[PDB]
Ligand binder design. Structure first.
Ligand SMILES: O=P(O)(O)OC[C@@H]1CC[C@@H](O)O1
Ligand SMILES: [Mn+2]
Ligand SMILES: [Mn+2]
Ligand SMILES: [Mn+2]
Length: 391
């Protein structure tokens, strides 16, 4: 093996400007990092800059450097959708024709009718909302009628809330599994179905840790599957295991924040493994992009950048660090959906003694999966061109 360990970091939703097919998605003008940089009157990301971020694209506060620490380029998405699952599945070697859907106006009547018909239960709500807001509004009605609160959010999700003392937890899970089956349908293909049990009394409802997520398996065996099948370590950090429904994962480390994510990354640097450590930093997407909060997004990017020198210090000669994103989510864009953007790619190993150079633009996110597969000598994905030899 060229590299004993590969550290792959997805900065979730951190796009680097509209992709050539942005118009199809209503995403003309989108630019996640660029608009944030402008809002911040110059982004302070000196460590990403040292890696070559400004060499990919110069933006306010983000300038090119003569000798980038590693190699740099951007990647174009080939799959139809701009959702988290599509982006991650593509990164790990797949091509996804069928997009997952988002539902800003709630779910189609046909889906909800069928869910009632299979469960013998009434459905109420049917709109985007946070868990606190929807429970405040409908929690009492739910308790009194035994109905099911169905709701969505900014992402591709179908959420079902029921009081634990009115709808037995085990029944709520059965209902969610039925909904998971009904949503395997391109007319209304949702990324995940989520059980949202809650307890308490009107004016004091709280969601319990009995939450359960029902994910789809990737539409293909991924590079992660191949690594796991060859007895390599595949350490998933943050939402990674959920995103892939555990496929190809040997260890999973839950995180509660971006900084906790960087702490777990550090934990894996301190582990003797051979294979892949795969981190998703989700705050960018969940707290800032969808909420259209460029200030919060800018601050999070700066907090993340400040953590990188410790990572640089810990990387061994036979370690490779890969930093990318899975789509854009421009916090100064109309609506609440993701944005169809190129994503940055930075590839750094301390063994790169004379620094990096520009890579040819990656025609699919699957170039990452191809590179990882080639490094570890496992079956090459059907899509993607390795850049291993360029490093
Ligand atoms: O319902 P919450 O707590 O406001 O969470 C928002 C989204 C819904 C599911 C996950 O994407 O997080
Ligand atoms: Mn748009
Ligand atoms: Mn994402
Ligand atoms: Mn999202």
């Amino acid at each position: 093996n060229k590299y004993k360990r590969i550290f792959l970091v997805v900065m979730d939703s951190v796009g680097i400007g509209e992709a050539p097919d942005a118009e199809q998605f209503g995403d003309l003008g989108s630019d996640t990092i660029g608009h944030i940089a402008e809002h911040m009157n110059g982004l302070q990301m000196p460590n990403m800059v040292k890696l070559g971020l400004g060499n990919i694209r110069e933006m306010k506060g983000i300038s090119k450097v003569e000798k980038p620490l590693g190699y740099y380029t951007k990647m174009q998405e080939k799959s139809t959708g701009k959702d988290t699952m599509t982006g991650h599945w593509e990164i790990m070697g797949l091509y996804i024709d069928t997009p997952f859907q988002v539902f800003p106006e709630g779910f189609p009547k046909e889906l909800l009718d069928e869910l009632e018909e299979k469960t013998g239960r009434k459905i109420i709500g049917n709109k985007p909302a946070s868990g606190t807001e929807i429970l405040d509004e409908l929690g009492q009605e739910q308790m009194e009628t035994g109905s099911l609160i169905v709701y969505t959010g900014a992402d591709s999700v179908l959420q079902i809330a029921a009081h634990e003392e009115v709808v037995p937890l085990d029944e709520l899970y059965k209902i969610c599994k039925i909904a998971r089956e009904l949503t395997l349908d391109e007319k209304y293909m949702v990324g995940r179905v989520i059980a949202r049990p809650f307890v308490g009394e009107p004016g004091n409802f709280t969601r319990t840790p009995n939450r359960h997520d029902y994910a789809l398996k990737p539409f293909g065996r991924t590079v992660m599957n191949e690594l796991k099948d060859s007895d390599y370590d595949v350490i998933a950090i943050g939402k990674i295991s959920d995103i892939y429904d555990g496929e190809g994962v040997t260890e999973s480390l839950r995180t509660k924040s971006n900084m906790d994510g960087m702490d777990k990354l550090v934990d894996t640097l301190n582990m003797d493994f051979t294979g892949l450590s795969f981190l998703n930093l989700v705050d960018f997407d969940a707290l800032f992009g969808h909420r259209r909060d460029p200030q919060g997004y800018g601050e999070a990017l700066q907090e993340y950048d400040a953590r990188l020198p410790e990572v640089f210090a810990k990387l061994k000669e036979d370690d490779l660090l890969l930093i990318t994103a899975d789509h854009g989510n421009d916090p100064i864009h109309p609506g609440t959906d993701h944005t169809r953007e190129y994503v940055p790619l930075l590839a750094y190993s301390p063994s790169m003694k004379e620094g990096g150079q520009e890579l040819p633009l990656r025609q699919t996110f699957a170039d990452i999966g191809a590179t990882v597969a080639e490094n570890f000598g496992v079956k090459m994905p059907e899509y993607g061109t390795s850049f291993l030899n360029e490093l």
